[PDB]
Each structure stands twice: as structure tokens, then as C-alpha cells.
Design an enzyme around this catalytic site. Sequence first.
Site, PDB file in Angstrom:
ATOM      1  CB  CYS B 106      11.572 -12.517  -0.942  1.00 22.09           C
ATOM      2  SG  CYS B 106      11.043 -12.603   0.618  1.00 22.09           S
ATOM      3  CD1 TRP B 278       9.387  -9.163   9.723  1.00 20.83           C
ATOM      4  CD2 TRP B 278       7.829 -10.694   9.790  1.00 20.83           C
ATOM      5  NE1 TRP B 278       9.868 -10.735   9.984  1.00 20.83           N
ATOM      6  CE2 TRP B 278       8.959 -11.342   9.934  1.00 20.83           C
ATOM      7  CE3 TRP B 278       6.457 -11.215  10.139  1.00 20.83           C
ATOM      8  CZ2 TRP B 278       8.704 -12.779  10.121  1.00 20.83           C
ATOM      9  CZ3 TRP B 278       6.326 -12.786  10.144  1.00 20.83           C
ATOM     10  CH2 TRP B 278       7.629 -13.483  10.271  1.00 20.83           C
TER      11      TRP B 278
HETATM   12  C1  HEM Z   1       7.764 -12.155   6.634  1.00 23.93           C
HETATM   13  C2  HEM Z   1       8.595 -11.212   6.469  1.00 23.93           C
HETATM   14  C3  HEM Z   1       9.279 -10.912   5.109  1.00 23.93           C
HETATM   15  C4  HEM Z   1      10.399 -10.044   4.882  1.00 23.93           C
HETATM   16  C5  HEM Z   1      11.339  -9.585   6.090  1.00 23.93           C
HETATM   17  C6  HEM Z   1      10.783  -9.779   3.704  1.00 23.93           C
HETATM   18  C7  HEM Z   1      11.800  -9.176   2.996  1.00 23.93           C
HETATM   19  C8  HEM Z   1      11.801  -8.747   1.970  1.00 23.93           C
HETATM   20  C9  HEM Z   1      12.459  -7.473   1.482  1.00 23.93           C
HETATM   21  C10 HEM Z   1      13.332  -6.545   2.221  1.00 23.93           C
HETATM   22  C11 HEM Z   1      12.449  -7.525   0.031  1.00 23.93           C
HETATM   23  C12 HEM Z   1      12.910  -6.152  -0.772  1.00 23.93           C
HETATM   24  C13 HEM Z   1      11.813  -4.973  -1.097  1.00 23.93           C
HETATM   25  C14 HEM Z   1      12.310  -4.021  -1.520  1.00 23.93           C
HETATM   26  O1  HEM Z   1      13.521  -3.441  -1.344  1.00 23.93           O
HETATM   27  O2  HEM Z   1      11.547  -3.114  -2.361  1.00 23.93           O
HETATM   28  C15 HEM Z   1      11.573  -8.340  -0.250  1.00 23.93           C
HETATM   29  C16 HEM Z   1      10.945  -8.556  -1.432  1.00 23.93           C
HETATM   30  C17 HEM Z   1      10.012  -9.458  -1.850  1.00 23.93           C
HETATM   31  N1  HEM Z   1       9.555 -10.481  -1.212  1.00 23.93           N
HETATM   32 FE1  HEM Z   1       9.619 -10.573   0.791  1.00 23.93          FE
HETATM   33  N2  HEM Z   1       9.856 -10.746   2.989  1.00 23.93           N
HETATM   34  C18 HEM Z   1       8.913 -11.168   3.797  1.00 23.93           C
HETATM   35  C19 HEM Z   1       7.484 -11.735   3.272  1.00 23.93           C
HETATM   36  C20 HEM Z   1       7.138 -11.766   2.117  1.00 23.93           C
HETATM   37  C21 HEM Z   1       6.070 -12.423   1.764  1.00 23.93           C
HETATM   38  C22 HEM Z   1       4.653 -12.801   2.849  1.00 23.93           C
HETATM   39  C23 HEM Z   1       5.830 -12.641   0.331  1.00 23.93           C
HETATM   40  C24 HEM Z   1       4.613 -12.925  -0.532  1.00 23.93           C
HETATM   41  C25 HEM Z   1       3.771 -13.860   0.040  1.00 23.93           C
HETATM   42  C26 HEM Z   1       7.037 -11.737  -0.098  1.00 23.93           C
HETATM   43  C27 HEM Z   1       7.251 -11.792  -1.306  1.00 23.93           C
HETATM   44  C28 HEM Z   1       8.289 -10.965  -1.914  1.00 23.93           C
HETATM   45  C29 HEM Z   1       8.567 -10.544  -3.267  1.00 23.93           C
HETATM   46  C30 HEM Z   1       7.609 -11.101  -4.339  1.00 23.93           C
HETATM   47  C31 HEM Z   1       9.551  -9.948  -3.334  1.00 23.93           C
HETATM   48  C32 HEM Z   1      10.278  -8.745  -4.547  1.00 23.93           C
HETATM   49  C33 HEM Z   1       9.301  -7.715  -5.059  1.00 23.93           C
HETATM   50  C34 HEM Z   1       9.850  -7.164  -6.345  1.00 23.93           C
HETATM   51  O3  HEM Z   1      10.677  -7.797  -7.173  1.00 23.93           O
HETATM   52  O4  HEM Z   1       9.778  -5.989  -6.824  1.00 23.93           O
HETATM   53  N3  HEM Z   1       7.913 -11.613   1.028  1.00 23.93           N
HETATM   54  N4  HEM Z   1      11.124  -9.385   0.667  1.00 23.93           N
HETATM   55  N1  LIG Z   2       8.980  -6.171   4.029  1.00 25.10           N
HETATM   56  C1  LIG Z   2       8.305  -6.109   2.888  1.00 25.10           C
HETATM   57  N2  LIG Z   2       8.966  -5.300   2.010  1.00 25.10           N
HETATM   58  C2  LIG Z   2       8.624  -5.575   0.662  1.00 25.10           C
HETATM   59  C3  LIG Z   2       8.306  -6.562   0.091  1.00 25.10           C
HETATM   60  C4  LIG Z   2       8.233  -6.803  -1.251  1.00 25.10           C
HETATM   61  C5  LIG Z   2       8.080  -5.642  -2.046  1.00 25.10           C
HETATM   62  C6  LIG Z   2       8.342  -4.160  -1.282  1.00 25.10           C
HETATM   63  C7  LIG Z   2       8.136  -3.122  -2.357  1.00 25.10           C
HETATM   64  N3  LIG Z   2       8.987  -3.105  -3.380  1.00 25.10           N
HETATM   65  C8  LIG Z   2       9.183  -1.752  -3.993  1.00 25.10           C
HETATM   66  C9  LIG Z   2      10.048  -1.969  -5.186  1.00 25.10           C
HETATM   67  C10 LIG Z   2      10.152  -0.848  -6.131  1.00 25.10           C
HETATM   68  C11 LIG Z   2       9.174  -0.739  -7.530  1.00 25.10           C
HETATM   69  C12 LIG Z   2       8.885   0.061  -8.160  1.00 25.10           C
HETATM   70  C13 LIG Z   2       9.912   1.124  -8.124  1.00 25.10           C
HETATM   71  C14 LIG Z   2      10.822   1.417  -7.177  1.00 25.10           C
HETATM   72  F1  LIG Z   2      11.775   2.372  -7.270  1.00 25.10           F
HETATM   73  C15 LIG Z   2      10.867   0.132  -6.233  1.00 25.10           C
HETATM   74  C16 LIG Z   2       8.491  -4.126  -0.032  1.00 25.10           C
HETATM   75  C17 LIG Z   2       7.095  -6.740   2.457  1.00 25.10           C
HETATM   76  C18 LIG Z   2       5.769  -6.600   2.049  1.00 25.10           C
HETATM   77  C19 LIG Z   2       5.175  -7.505   2.083  1.00 25.10           C
HETATM   78  C20 LIG Z   2       5.390  -8.845   2.568  1.00 25.10           C
HETATM   79  S1  LIG Z   2       7.053  -8.355   3.132  1.00 25.10           S
END
Ligand code: HEM
Ligand SMILES: N=C(Nc1cccc(CNCCc2cccc(F)c2)c1)c1cccs1
Lengths: 411, 407
Positions: B106, B278
Amino acid sequence: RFLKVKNWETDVVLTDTLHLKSTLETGCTEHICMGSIMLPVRTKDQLFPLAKEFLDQYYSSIKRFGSKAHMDRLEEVNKEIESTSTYQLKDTELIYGAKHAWRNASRCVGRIQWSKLQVFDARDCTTAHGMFNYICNHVKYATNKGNLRSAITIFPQRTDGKHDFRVWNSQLIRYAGYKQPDGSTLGDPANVQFTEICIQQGWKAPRGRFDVLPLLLQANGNDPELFQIPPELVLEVPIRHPKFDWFKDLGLKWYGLPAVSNMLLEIGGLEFSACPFSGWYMGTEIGVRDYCDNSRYNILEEVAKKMDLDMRKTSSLWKDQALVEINIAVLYSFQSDKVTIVDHHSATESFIKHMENEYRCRGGCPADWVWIVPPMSGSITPVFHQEMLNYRLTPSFEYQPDPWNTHVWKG
Amino acid sequence: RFLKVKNWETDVVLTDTLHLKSTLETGCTEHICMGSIMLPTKDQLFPLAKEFLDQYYSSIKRFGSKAHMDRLEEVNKEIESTSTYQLKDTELIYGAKHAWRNASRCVGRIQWSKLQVFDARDCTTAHGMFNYICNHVKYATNKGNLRSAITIFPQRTDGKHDFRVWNSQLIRYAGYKQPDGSTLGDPANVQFTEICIQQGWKAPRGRFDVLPLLLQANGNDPELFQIPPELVLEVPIRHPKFDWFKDLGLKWYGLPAVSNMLLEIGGLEFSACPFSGWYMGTEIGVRDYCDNSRYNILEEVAKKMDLDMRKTSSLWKDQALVEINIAVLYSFQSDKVTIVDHHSATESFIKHMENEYRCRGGCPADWVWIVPPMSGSITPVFHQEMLNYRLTPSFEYQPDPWNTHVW
Ligand code: HEM
Ligand SMILES: N=C(Nc1cccc(CNCCc2cccc(F)c2)c1)c1cccs1
Ligand code: HEM
Ligand SMILES: N=C(Nc1cccc(CNCCc2cccc(F)c2)c1)c1cccs1
Ligand SMILES: C[C@H](O)[C@H](O)[C@H]1CNc2nc(N)[nH]c(=O)c2N1
Ligand SMILES: C[C@H](O)[C@H](O)[C@H]1CNc2nc(N)[nH]c(=O)c2N1
Ligand SMILES: OC[C@@H](O)[C@@H](O)[C@H](O)[C@H](O)CO
Ligand SMILES: OC[C@@H](O)[C@@H](O)[C@H](O)[C@H](O)CO
Ligand SMILES: OC[C@@H](O)[C@@H](O)[C@H](O)[C@H](O)CO
Ligand SMILES: [Zn+2]
């Protein structure tokens, strides 16, 4: 065991068995991934298994495994090791070993080309003047007036580690950098330290923005010597843009021939510490990294200024906009001068086809995603979506410390 | 055992010790790096609870105090008897903030301490889940001025009574495989869309149909609910220079809210824990709009720009990519819906890594996910060495519920 990798754009799944042949270690463990870390004198004891493993690989590839030629060669090498403590590669084994080090280079996006490599055998070289001559010949052959041909020149292997052949340059052709008293840099900041070493050794620096550095060559563990590559052998491209006529007035140019000279080639436990190799550029190397890294020529601002983009907020994407225009310019210029170059779309698409072929015929293709994905437009290239497995096979290219940090000066 | 990470742009070296606290495994070995792979009883529970309570009590400067020892005893007591335990509100909040703090993928974690935690552990039915979720949507949206929030539904018991949100995000568009053979709408959600239909949703069959919620309480069969339209803030996409851009008919939603992950705290498992923040602009403009298996609009945009699509080396894809991303940011900004650009976000993350190294001894980070999908090396994270490792509390992937559920 079998490992699967999946492409998330295509759902194509591939199965890796080649990883079972990997010997060298990755840096990672079950508790920590070191995948984004930049950086990853032998006994007779360690040498014979390394030689045997290599010779078995070589003999299998020529479909002579276990033949009399195979067995006699193992015995001949064994006897040579315990008698002289090392061994010499036959020419065919050297060629095979150099091609395979390239095939095995997991950070290389250009490996579709791996079997087309001209190998220059420079193991009879003895002096730095000899090395100069070998290097000039390499550059002229590889340049081929713009129709670039991949090549490697292989100087004598390591003996006791006190007699190493080394090219001190990091690439055969590269630009000087000069730190000014006011703290700004003239030319290429990546090369200040090496430029300082050249000057100390006697080089008369022109002190401009694009001075081709002299070669600093070390033969047989002796103190290195300075040589200037004949300018007529150094092909360069002035950079202009197909639509922006002010682009030429930025005064940019770059050299056509990327030639890496500071790696170590390991074949069957032998260590070739001077093994300059060349191919051709992928455009992003120059347009993204050389021109736009903050620590390199850093041209983004000047370009965006001339484009009159809104530079008050990063969210106008002015940097991204200027980046694209500079990269268009690099490809346009090379193509217009008929100097070989590949764009990052073509290169990554070719790499995916190479990788799939390798999985089918070889059982795998070690690949380092961090390095394979281009430094712009990552996800609109197919590699971004491709899962990869990174492991280390030999023969291989390896890092080695800069020689000024280790050299015993004779004076 | 003490590890160095170098920034290759600035030469700043940081030292990581926090990794020694890591518990879970990576997928990697000394023989193979799996860095780019997308998905790598009572006896088990007390060590996990102790490890958690130890870090909690340490965090409030009361490590080894009577309050600390007493709670350890109490939870021990409760697992012994009930085979599980309940977190105090304070522990739950701490654990949720820390699961975010620990999320190696993240980039937005500079924000981690500002998370509004909605305790929905008293929830019992799908209609109840719907109510909590609407309240979360409205709170988080805050009329465009988005606020990070998580809603935490009851924890797993015997695993036959799981709470789940079947949706992958709370707000997302439907996908419909067509007679044509093309896909209308979002191809990522085709399967879920059909499930909704087959559960009885009446699909409008447009390009941008907000999915209904498919909510599962107490391991029961999941039920459909439409989110009040008035709670779904959407943004029409236009370009500050290309007047024709709006004719593409593109929109996106303001609130990214992930609903398919599992929150693990002190060994307890919260299988429904929707969380929102966001957007970073590239998520929509690079991935949602330009991925080949997504809205895949690069060709149409390039055409409207009249670029030479003959040769890859004209960089027509790259030019169009930048414009689409300029439009996303401009549209969100013009409508005052919070969004961050990739330059801004990655600059923040470097500052956050430095804080974490300075204050905590490290920051697990997955470089493959952290580096934005466009313009990688012009962002500072590209040049930053990162160590990836798994700390708990954590967010974890879990199988899609339809594969598991017994109807
Ligand atoms: C506040 C603004 C936030 C921004 C701009 C942000 C940004 C991001 C982005 C761009 C990703 C990549 C998602 C993707 O490519 O699918 C990500 C991953 C993630 N973020 Fe955030 N984030 C934010 C807040 C949060 C919050 C509030 C949480 C949880 C309480 C969180 C937990 C995660 C997790 C767990 C992932 C990884 C998901 C995975 O492994 O598939 N983030 N974050
Ligand atoms: N900006 C955001 N983006 C985001 C953050 C965490 C997770 C995700 C969604 N991830 C999808 C990843 C994924 C999973 C399975 C298959 C695939 F191709 C891609 C999006 C936020 C979502 C919630 C708080 S921040
Ligand atoms: C034929 C055209 C080739 C192209 C377009 C190409 C492309 C590349 C590029 C773009 C990189 C990354 C460079 C960087 O960011 O620093 C690279 C890495 C590399 N390639 Fe190539 N390559 C080619 C040929 C070769 C040849 C001929 C060899 C050796 C025989 C070679 C061996 C390597 C090695 C060892 C690396 C990794 C360098 C490191 O770890 O620091 N490649 N390739
Ligand atoms: N197109 C090429 N590029 C290339 C290939 C392999 C290596 C390199 C140079 N790598 C530089 C690595 C490096 C060094 C110092 C600092 C740093 F951040 C990164 C460039 C070729 C060079 C030789 C054959 S193909
Ligand atoms: C820290 C990080 O590993 C480093 O910046 C890497 C990232 N990926 C790269 N990829 C290539 N091709 N060349 C590089 O120099 C780098 N640098
Ligand atoms: C195969 C590869 O791991 C995969 O495409 C990853 C790469 N990096 C990513 N990074 C982010 N932030 N999101 C992603 O979905 C992905 N996909
Ligand atoms: O100025 C010295 C540098 O060019 C040199 O140290 C290189 O960075 C090194 O050889 C790795 O490429
Ligand atoms: O010096 C850091 C990078 O800018 C540099 O190694 C380039 O990527 C290289 O010159 C590309 O060929
Ligand atoms: O579907 C694969 C990706 O395009 C997708 O997961 C996006 O990256 C995501 O929707 C961005 O928030
Ligand atoms: Zn790894």
C-alpha cells in the site's frame, strides 16, 4: 517439483522445472524478499564439480552426453585441474558458455537474441595495448555503421586474483562528468568518480557535456593504462523531435553502441573478469533513465518549459508529458540515422514470446520482474502482467567491485 | 540479520531491524524469488493473542504492567474456556490501524493512523450489514472530501457462520459477456455480475451499472441490496484541453472500498472488513481504463487524438495513456472529489518510509506493487530499495465465497 506462473492479462499459465537446476542463491528467504535490492581465488576442490556440471550441460546440448568425446574431455579437464590447478576452455565451450550466460541473465529483456552473439576470443592477450586493439575491433564490428551486431570479447581468465584483466570503464563508450566548485555537474553525473580517475591518470579532459571517456585498461594485474577510442569508430546520434523543431536546440546527442565492460563472466567455475559485451539500446534506457533520472542528465524541466506545460502542479502530469516527447525523439533520431534501436513495446512483446518458447523447450526462463518492466508506461507493456520466477543459473554474468577499490598499485 | 536499504537516487541508506519481528512466510526461498507472483484450534490461538497483546501494551508504554499481565491472563482464561476471545474496542482499533500500517503493497500508508473504525461486531443479519455499509459509504464519501474508514463485522467462529461481502469492492461496475462475443462494461466483474443476476438482480445492461451488494451474514445465503444512488458519488471524465474527451462517455466512482479481504488480529479472523480511502489517479486512468482485459480504451482515445497508430515506436499508446490520466485527475479535482496523483503519493510514501525506519526500525514494502504502472522511474519509489516481509495484524487474501459457500 513444478512451479506455475500466470499471465494476468491472458490467463496463460506456464510450468517451470528449470528452477531445479539452479545452484547459486537469491538473497531471499522464507521470511524476507530481497527482490528489489540492486546488488545480489578458487580451490581445486570446488573447481572440478563446477567444470563437470558445465561440461555435462555442454555435452547434452550437442547431443553427445556420455559419448567417448564427453568422457575423455571430463578426464582431460580433471587431470588439468589437479596438475595446473585450473583449466582452459575449448573454443566451442567458450562460445557456448558466453551465449548461455546471456540466455541465463534474468534482468535482460533482450534475450530473444541470445543465440546470435559474436564471440571474440581474446585469451591470448597480454598487455593493455593488446586490450585496446581487441576493444577497437569489437566496437568497429559491433557498430557495423549503425546495423548493430551483438558481440563479446573475452580476455584471459582469473588465475591467482593478483593478475586480473579489467576494463575500468563501466561501458566502453560513455560520457565524462565533472563536478564544479559551485556543486553543479557538467556532463554525466553517473561518471564523475571515474572521470576524476582518468584525469589523475593523465587524461586531458575537454570538459564539455558529452565527452567520450578514454579507455582505462588493466592487463595481467598491472596498473591500468589510458587510450582514446578513435573518434571515427564512435557512432553518435544527435537527438531531434519529429514535430518539435526546438528539440534539436537542447544540444542532446547519445552514442549508438551500449557496451557493458565491468561485469564478470563465470563459465564452469572459471572467472573472466574482463568480458566487454554489446548489443543495442532499448529507447527508454536513454530517453527515460540517461536523460530523465534526477541524478543523470535531468532534462525534464527544460523540456517541459519549452513545451510550455503547466508546471505549477505535479497533477497536470507535465513530467509524464515531457517524458513521452523525449522518448519519441530518441526513437525518431536513431531510426532516422539508421542506427539499431528497439522501443519498449516491441522489446517486451518479443520478450514474452521468447519466455514462452523457453518454457516449452527449456522448462523455464529465470526473469527479474523489477528489471524487465520498462521504466515508463509499465502496465501497457505485456511484461507488467506476467508473473516471473527469478533464479540463478550458470554460466552467468555477475557483478564485481569497481577495480579502483581493490587494485594494488604498482606505481 | 540487520539489513540495509539504499536509495539509488539520493544515496540515503536506512537500516531495517523490524523484519526480525516477521512471523508469516513470503513464498521466496534462497533458490527462488517469487516477488512478482500475485498470490503467494485453541493451541494455535494463545501464542497469536500473546504476541498481539504484547505489542499493544508496548505501544501504550505499559509493557509488563499489571494491566498488561491481567489482560493476558483474562484472554488466556477465555480461550481455555470458549476456544476464542473478544478484543477490547481499543485493541480492535489498534489492530485495524496496524493491519493498514503493515500492508506492504500500500503506497498510501502515511495516512495509516487516521482511520475511522466502525465496530459492527454486534451485527446479525444481511439487512444489518447493508445498514452499516451505507453508513460507512456516506461517512467516507463526506461529499467528496473522502475519509479513510473500515467497518468490522463479526469474527470467524467455527467457519460455517462466516460474514462475507461477496463484492470485491463496495462500489463497482457490472460486466456482461455478449452475443456479439465482446464484453459490455467492466470485464473484471463478469462472473460476479452473473451471480447477482442468477440471485435475481435485474441488470440494466449498461457500460457503468453500479453493482448491488451481495451480503452474507452468519454463514447464511447471501442477499441483494441496492446502495442508494444518492450515496454513490460518481465523476464524469473530461479533459482540460480536449473538448471531445467527454464524448467518450467515461465516468468513474469516487470511493474505492475493498470488501473481499480478511483482517487478522491477534489470531482472530474478520472475514468481512470492508475498508476505503481514496484513489491514486493511475488506478483508474492506467489500470481501469487501459488494461487490455479492462475498459481497454487506448485505441479509441488514440484515434480521437489522430495519432499515427501505424508503428509502436511512435509511442501513440504512451501519449494517449498520459492524456487519459490527465483527464482523470482534472475531472476528480474539478468536482472536488479527493484524489492523489502518482508523483504526490510516491513522494509521501518515501517520507513515510523514512518516518517508519526512524520510529519503528523498518517498513515492509513490495516494490512491484508500490511503483506506479506508468512513469515508474520518474517517481522516487523506483529508485528506493524495499524489503518485503509479512507482519501481523494484516490484511490477507481469501477465496471468493461462491467457490466455498454451501447453498
Ligand atoms: C487513503 C488513501 C489510500 C491510498 C491512496 C492507497 C493507495 C493504494 C494503492 C494504489 C494500492 C494498490 C491497489 C491495486 O493496485 O490494486 C493499495 C494497496 C493496498 N492498500 Fe492502500 N491506499 C489508501 C488507503 C488504505 C486503507 C484505508 C487501507 C486499509 C485500511 C489500505 C490497505 C491496502 C492494502 C491491504 C493494499 C494491498 C491489497 C492487495 O495486496 O491486493 N490502504 N493502496
Ligand atoms: N485506492 C485504493 N485502491 C485499492 C487498494 C487496495 C486494493 C485495491 C484493489 N486491488 C485489486 C488487486 C487484484 C486482485 C485480484 C486480481 C487482480 F487482477 C487484481 C484497490 C483503495 C481501496 C481502499 C482503501 S484505498
Ligand atoms: C541485443 C540487444 C539487447 C537489448 C535490447 C538488451 C536490453 C537490456 C536492457 C534494457 C537491460 C537493462 C539495463 C539497465 O537498466 O541497466 C539489460 C540487462 C542485461 N542484459 Fe541485455 N540486452 C541486449 C543484449 C545483451 C547482450 C548481448 C548481453 C550479453 C551478452 C546482455 C546481457 C545483459 C545483462 C547481464 C543484463 C543485466 C545487467 C545488470 O544486472 O546490471 N544483453 N538488457
Ligand atoms: N542495451 C543494453 N543496456 C544495458 C545492458 C546491461 C547493463 C546495462 C547497464 N546497467 C547499469 C546498472 C547500474 C549501474 C550503476 C548504478 C545503477 F543504478 C544501475 C545496460 C546493453 C549493453 C550491452 C549489451 S545490451
Ligand atoms: C531499487 C531498485 O531495485 C532499482 O532502482 C532498480 C529498479 N529496476 C531497474 N530496472 C532496470 N532495467 N534498471 C535499473 O537500473 C533498475 N533499477
Ligand atoms: C504479475 C505482476 O505481479 C502483476 O501484474 C502485478 C504487478 N504490480 C502491480 N501493482 C499494483 N499496484 N497492482 C497490481 O495489480 C499489480 N499487478
Ligand atoms: O563514476 C564511477 C561510476 O561510473 C561507476 O562506479 C559505476 O557506477 C559502476 O561501474 C557500476 O556501473
Ligand atoms: O545511473 C542510473 C541509471 O540512470 C543508468 O544505469 C541507466 O539506466 C543506464 O545508463 C541505461 O543503459
Ligand atoms: O483487474 C486488474 C486491474 O486492472 C485492477 O485490479 C485495477 O488495478 C484496480 O481496479 C485499481 O484500483
Ligand atoms: Zn524474493
